[model samples]
Structure formats: C-alpha cells, structure tokens
Target: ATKAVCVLKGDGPVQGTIHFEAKGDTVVVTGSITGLTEGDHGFHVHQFGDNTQGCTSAGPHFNPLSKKHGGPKDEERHVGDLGNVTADKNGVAIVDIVDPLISLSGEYSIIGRTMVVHEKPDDLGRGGNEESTKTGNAGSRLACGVIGIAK
Candidate 1:
C-alpha cells in the first residue's frame, strides 16, 4: 500500500506523528498527538507544503473544486475539510479517520500539502456561525506538518 507521514510541530511543546495510507479510494489517517487541550480540534489539509513561513502562509484549505467548507462526509465539502479530531484529558489525540476526498497520488494529490490542527473544534459548517463556510470557524492554528510520501 502507498503511504505517507507527517511530523507535527507547534509553537510550544505540542507534537504529533501522523501517518497516511491509501486503501482503495479512501485515505486512512492515523495520528499520534499530544499537548492539546481536552477537546476536539479542527484538522485539515492546507494548500501548500511551504515551511518557511510557518503555518500562517500555508495558504487556504486544499480546495480546487471551489466549494464551501463542510464536514468530511458532506456532499459539498472542500478537499481538505477533514472535520475534527478529539483529544483526551491527557492532552492526547489518537486520530483515526478514513476520508473519501483526500488522495496521496494522481490528480489533486495532497502529497505536497500540509495538515493543520486548530485550537478549537470545527463546526463542520453546519449553520452554527459565519466563518463556518470559509474556515469552519476553527480557531488559531496550533500545529501542522507537511505531507511527504514514504517511498
């Protein structure tokens, strides 16, 4: 199976090791994370893999279809709308998500993009608020990592 990995880093002591694997048309994301508040956090793939500017200049979500933000399972969602991952009381998030949108290779491949973790939970653009359509109202960027293929 084709695979990828990302080493997540945050401003302080936050850290994570994320793995991606291709299984048919879906991508299986497994993340080992730590140092986050006990809550759900927004997780998505950003437009660029650039590391020089940190997370701010990574550009918007990887949306080539020109669609509004939505949940991972929503019919109308950005390619990067990965929804949220939950963190426990120990500030650890064991993420395991199977996404139908993202891909590692072929057209619109996310190989060179980045994965970001937000400080707040993603609303999934479910009519909760405004910035929901554009950013899921997810709070500040806490950590991120550029996606890379593993041979």
Candidate 2:
C-alpha cells in the first residue's frame, strides 16, 4: 500500500490523512477529512499543488479530458472536479472515492496537486459563465494545501 500527503485549506483549521492504492483502471482513496464549518464545502484536486495563500493560486481544476468544469456527477465536467465535501459539526469529512481517471502508477498521482477548501458550497453548474460552468454557484477561494506522496 502506498501513502500520500494531502493538505487542507481555509481560514478554519482542519486535519486529515489519506491512504490510497492505485490498481488497474481504478484508484481507491480512503482518508479522513477533518476540520471545517458545520456546512458543505467544495473539495477537489486543483491543477497546481502550490498553496499560495488563496485558492486562485491553485490554478484551475485538472482537466486532462478537456471537458467542462463540473461536478463528478456531471456528464461534461472536468475530470478532476470532485464536487463538494460535507462536514459534520466537528468540521470533518471522511472521504472514500474510487476514481477511475486517477492513476496511482501513472502521471496523475494526487501527490503533487493542491486540495482546495471553498468558503461556500459549489452549485455544480450555476456559478457564472465559463468559470463556474462545472462547479456550483459557491463563492470565495477559502484555503488550500499541497498533496504529496505519503512516506
């Protein structure tokens, strides 16, 4: 089993760790996303891994397929747009997603990208023109952290 490092972003403080294993055609991601508001927050893998204070610096969502920027449920959204992560009153989120697009042995390892935490929930397709095509109508670039390979 291979491990990786994932960072949390936002004015609020959250802590978590992820354990992942990449097999043929599928990547199993199991981790605990803790710390956040008692509401919903947009969580996704940004193109860049640099946590430059604001989420804008994280660049756009990973779109290897050149599709629109939408949620994971969208038919025409970016391949990296994972939609939202709901947190409990403890401000924590435990994630377990099997993404077929992400390759652990391939180049798309989640070790270098930045994980962003939005201040608001993403509308999934109601934010603005072009920019918010896939994400929800949520606003603000809350916080971010770099995702690195686990040691």
Candidate 3:
C-alpha cells in the first residue's frame, strides 16, 4: 500500500509523527504526539506544506471543496477537518482514523500540505461564532509538519 509520513515539530519540545496509508477509498491515519496538555487538541491538514514561518505559515485548512469547517464525518466539511486528538494525563496523544475526504494521489491529495496540532479543542464548527464556520474555534497551533511520501 502507498503511504505517507509527517514528522511533527513545534515551539518548545512538542513533537510527533503521523502516518497515512491509502486503503481503498479511505486513508488510515496512525500516529502519536507528545508534549501536549491532558486535553483535546485540534488536528488538521493545512493548505500549504511550508513551515518556513512555522505553523502560522501553513495557512488555512485544505478546503478545496470550499466547504465549512466541521468534523471528519460531516458531509459539508473541509477536507482537512479531521477533528480533535485527545491527550492522556501522560501528555501523549495517539491518533487512529480512517478518512475518506483526503487522498495521497489526487486533487484532494494532502501530500504537499501541512499537518497541524492546535492548543485547543476544535468545536467542530458547531460553535455559533464567526470563526466557528471558518476555523471551528481551534486555537493557536502547537505543532506542525509537512506531509511527504513514505518509502
């Protein structure tokens, strides 16, 4: 199976890795992140892979469909809206999901984008605020990594 990998980095010592494997019409995401608070954090694929300006340069979520920010299972959600990752008391967060909105070799491909972990939980666009429909209220980015093909 074709696969992709991302080595996450952020200010301070926050670090992690994300693995993406194509399976049929879905992609299996498996990985772990550390150095986070014991709570929920937003996770997503940003439009640009460039980390030259750090996570801020990653830009918005990969929303080719021009859809609103929502959860992974939402019908009208951005392709990058994979939702939140919860960290345990030990400050480790593990992610395991099967997403149908993104691909490794197509128009919605995320290979050249960025993966980001936020400092706050994503409200899944349910919060009734202006930014809710745009960012789901996910706070400052905590970590970032460029997605690349795996050997």
Candidate 4:
C-alpha cells in the first residue's frame, strides 16, 4: 500500500538506490544508478534477497507463475521481468519507469526479493539463443539490492 525501497550495491564501484510505489495496476520506479558503463542494462526483480554470494545469491527471476521471460509489456512474461533501464554518458541512470506487471502489494508483490542490474541489455526473449528466452541474454549481474518496505 505504501512505498518500497532498495539500495543496490556491487563491486567495481557500483552503487545505487531505487524506489517502488504502486499506482493502481502499475508500479512507478524511481532511482539513480551510478558507476554504470553508459548504456542500457537489464533490470529485474529476482526471486530471493540472499546476498551471501553477491548478486548471484539472489537466484533466478521471480517467476512465481512459471512463465517464460519477456519484456514488461509482454503478457507472457515472468512476474519479475521488468525489461531494461538505460544509463547516460556519465554512468548514471535516472530511473523513471512505470510497469504494469510489477506490484507492491498482494500475492504477486516483489517485496523481499532482489532488484538486479545486468552487464548487458536485455534481449526481451527475441534473441535466438537459449539464455535469451530465459534471461533476455542480459549477461552477468552488475549490481543488486533487496526490496524492502519503506518507512
């Protein structure tokens, strides 16, 4: 019902924070990611918040309904498949996205899950490769954070 926040942290000087707020069928995402490589990056809500093994400890995307990977607009996408977030030339991404598939409350809520940024752009399941259908071929994880309820 209220707002949620996640603080992204990673090695290689990556650091950022994002916020989530529900507005009817969509969730408004706002944040600033710093230390990027000045391009598009794969962003999503993973299944777990376990950071013991770094970003990999977050596990797979939060597809509780067992759906294939797709963009945020695709009806056949995972619950956590949020598509990409682009960064500017200064390695900073001024996040401002409204997604219908993401939620802040109810059975499909992403709270306690992981918000991840990948090293490459998400193919949105259009790539012919195997990893494309599953992970959008977003490449390796660059940064991640645990979604939590905000004050």
Q: Pick the candidate with the highest lDDT.
A: 3
State model 3's lDDT: 0.92
TM-score of each prediction: 0.96, 0.78, 0.97, 0.96
Model 2, which residues run further than 4 Å from truth? 126-131
After TM-score superposition, the amount by which residue 27's alpha carbon in candidate 2 deviates from its true location, in angstroms, is: 1.8
Candidate 4, residues 31-149, lDDT tens digits: the string is 88999998889999999989999998899999989999999888899999888888898899888889887788888899989999999999999999889889999999998999999
Residue lDDT tens for model 2, 6-108? 6554665665565567666776767767767778777677788775546677787777777766776668776676777788887877776777766555566
The runs of at least 3 residues in candidate 4 whose Cα sits more than 4 Å from the true structure, single-residue gaps closed, are none
What Cα-based lDDT does every candidate model obtain?
0.89, 0.69, 0.92, 0.90
Clashing pairs in 3: none
Error of 1 at 92 (Å): 0.2
What is the lDDT for 86 in model 2?
80
C-alpha RMSD between model 4 and the true structure: 1.0
lDDT of 2 at 99: 71
Q: Candidate 4: give the clashing pairs.
A: none
Number of backbone-clashing residue pairs for each candidate, in the order shown = 0, 15, 0, 0
Candidate 1 structure quality by residue, lDDT tens digits, 25-134: 99999968899899899999999998787789778999999999999989989999989889899999998999888998887689989999998989899856779999
Alpha carbon lDDT at 49, candidate 2 = 73
